[PDB]
Amino acid sequence: TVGAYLPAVFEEVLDLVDAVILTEKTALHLRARRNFRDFRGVSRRTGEEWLVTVQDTEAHVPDVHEEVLGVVPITTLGPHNYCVILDPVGPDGKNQLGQKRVVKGEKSFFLQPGEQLEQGIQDVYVLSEQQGLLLRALQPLEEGEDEEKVSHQAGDHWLIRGPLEYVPSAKVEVVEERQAIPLDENEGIYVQDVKTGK
Amino acid sequence: TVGAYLPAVFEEVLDLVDAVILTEKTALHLRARRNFRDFRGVSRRTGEEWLVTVQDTEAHVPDVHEEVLGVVPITTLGPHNYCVILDPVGPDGKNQLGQKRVVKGEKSFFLQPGEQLEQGIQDVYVLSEQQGLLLRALQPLEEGEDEEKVSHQAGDHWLIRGPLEYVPSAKVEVVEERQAIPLDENEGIYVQDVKTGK
Numbered sequence: 560t561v562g563a564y565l566p567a568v569f570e571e572v573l574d575l576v577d578a579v580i581l582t583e584k585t586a587l588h589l590r591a592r593r594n595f596r597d598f599r600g601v602s603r604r605t606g607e608e609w610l611v612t613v614q615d616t617e618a619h620v621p622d623v624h625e626e627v628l629g630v631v632p633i634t635t636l637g638p639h640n641y642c643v644i645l646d647p648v649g650p651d652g653k654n655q656l657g658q659k660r661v662v663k664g665e666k667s668f669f670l671q672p673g674e675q676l677e678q679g680i681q682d683v684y685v686l687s688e689q690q691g692l693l694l695r696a697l698q699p700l701e702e703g704e705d706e707e708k709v710s711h712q713a714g715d716h717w718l719i720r721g722p723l724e725y726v727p728s729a730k731v732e733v734v735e736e737r738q739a740i741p742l743d744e745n746e747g748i749y750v751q752d753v754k755t756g757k
Numbered sequence: 758t759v760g761a762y763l764p765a766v767f768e769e770v771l772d773l774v775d776a777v778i779l780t781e782k783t784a785l786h787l788r789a790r791r792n793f794r795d796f797r798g799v800s801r802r803t804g805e806e807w808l809v810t811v812q813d814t815e816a817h818v819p820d821v822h823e824e825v826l827g828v829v830p831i832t833t834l835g836p837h838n839y840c841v842i843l844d845p846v847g848p849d850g851k852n853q854l855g856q857k858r859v860v861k862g863e864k865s866f867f868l869q870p871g872e873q874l875e876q877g878i879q880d881v882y883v884l885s886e887q888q889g890l891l892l893r894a895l896q897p898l899e900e901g902e903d904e905e906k907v908s909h910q911a912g913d914h915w916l917i918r919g920p921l922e923y924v925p926s927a928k929v930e931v932v933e934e935r936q937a938i939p940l941d942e943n944e945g946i947y948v949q950d951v952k953t954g955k
Contacts, residue, residue, distance in 0.1 A: 580804035583851055617792070617802035635854040638928075639895060667854045685895060687912040689951065722912030724896070742954045 578618040579630075586669045587611040587619055588628040595624040608672040628672075635667040636680060641726045643677035644670075663726045684725040684733075691720035691737035698730040776816040777828075784867045785809040785817055786826040793822040806870040826870075833865040834878060839924045841875035842868075861924045882923040882931075889918035889935035896928040 566572045579587055588610060591603040599615060603624075610631060611619050621627050636642060640663075647660035654673035662668070663683065670676070684692060696711040703709075711717065718737065719725055727733055740748060751757075764770045777785055786808060789801040797813060801822075808829060809817050819825050834840060838861075845858035852871035860866070861881065868874070882890060894909040901907075909915065916935065917923055925931055938946060949955075 578803070582804050584854070617804060633854065637855040637857075640855075665853075665855050685911050687893070687914060690912070722894075722910035724911035739951075741949060741951045743949065744955060746954075 576620060578620040579627075580618050581611065581613045581616065583613050584633045586613075586631040586633070588631050588672060589621075590626045590628055592624050592626055595622075597622065597625070610669055610671060612669065631669050633667055633669055634676070634680070636662065636665065638665045639682055639685070640680050641683050642680055643729070645675040645677055646673050648674060659729050661726065661729055684727070686719070686721065686723060686725060688720070688722050689739045691718050691739070692725060692733060693718055693735040693737055694727070694731055694733045696730060697732055700728065700730045702728070774818060776818040777825075778816050779809065779811045779814065781811050782831045784811075784829040784831070786829050786870060787819075788824045788826055790822050790824055793820075795820065795823070808867055808869060810867065829867050831865055831867055832874070832878070834860065834863065836863045837880055837883070838878050839881050840878055841927070843873040843875055844871050846872060857927050859924065859927055882925070884917070884919065884921060884923060886918070886920050887937045889916050889937070890923060890931060891916055891933040891935055892925070892929055892931045894928060895930055898926065898928045900926070 581587060588608065590608040591605055593605050594603060596602050598619075603609075608628070634642070642662050644660040644662060646654040646656050647658065648671045649655045659677065686692065693716060695716045696713060698713055700711055701708055716734065720737075742748070779785060786806065788806040789803055791803050792801060794800050796817075801807075806826070832840070840860050842858040842860060844852040844854050845856065846869045847853045857875065884890065891914060893914045894911060896911055898909055899906055914932065918935075940946070
C-alpha cells in the first residue's frame, strides 16, 4: 500500500522492499523458498526455480516466498550465429540432462535455470566453392537437405563443399577444413585413396 | 502555475524544475519511473523508455514519473552517406535484437533507445568504370536492381563494376576493391581461373 504505513503493536517492521524493473534484455531468476502461489497464479514447490520476464510484469517485487538468484541477461544471436544449449528444457519443464540443443539464426532467448551454453555464441560455417569441410558422424543420422535422404553410420566421414552456410549438428563433429588446390593444365598431384590404397 | 506560489502547511517545497527546450536537432530521452500517463496521453510501464521530439512540444518539463537519461542529438546523413542501425525498432516498438538495418540517402533521424550505429556515418561506394568491388554473400539474397533478378548463394563471390554508387547490404560483405589494368595492344597478363585452374 503506497503512502505512510503505520506498524502495528505485534508487527515488527524490518526493512523496505523495492521492485525489480524488467527490461526486454533482462529477466529475474527466482527459487521458491516453500510451497506457495505466485502473482500469475501457479503453484510452486520448494527449491524449484523459474524465470520472470517482461511478458509477466514490467516490475516485479521479490516475494518472501521467493529468492533472488540473479538477473539473467538475454542471449541474442545474429543471422550469422549459432549456439549449443547444455541440458535443454524439455516439454515437461525439466532439464534433459546430458543432451544438447542447437539453436541457429536470428533468435533471442533467456538461458532457463539449468541450461548453459556449450562454448558461447558461435558463428556458422559459410563456405565458398574453393572451401570444404571434412566432418565425421557420431551417431546414425538422417538429414534431408535436398529431396533425397542421405544416411551416415556412426563412423562415416564425408565432405561438405560448395557455396553454402553450414551449422554443425549435435551428432556431427567437424574434423578438418579443406581448400581446393589450383592446378593448371599439365599440372597435378599424387592422391592416395587410403580406403583402398590406390 | 506561473507567478508567486505559496506552499501549504503539509507540502514541503524541495526545488524548482525548469523545462527542456527541444530544438529540431535534439530530442529528450525519458525512462518511466512507474506506470502513468504522459502529456500526449499514452500509458507507460516501469523501466520503459521513449523519445520526445519537437513534434510533441517545443519545451517539455521533466515529470516526476519520468527520468532524464540525456539529450539525443540528431543523426543526419548526406546524399553520399549511409549507416547501419544495430537492433532496429520494429513495427511493435520493441528492438529487433541481433538484426541490423541499413539506412541510405539524405535522411535525418534520432537513434531510438536501444538502437546504435554499427560504425558511425559511412560514405557509399561510388565507382568508375576503371574500379570494381569484389564482395561475397553471407545469406541467400535476391536483388532486382535491373528488370531481371540475380540470386546468390551463401558463399557466392561476384564482382561489382561500372559507373555506379554502391551501398553494402546487410547480407553482403565487401572483400576487395579492384582496379582495371591498362594494357596496350600486344601486351597482356597471365590470369589463372582458380575455380578451374586454367
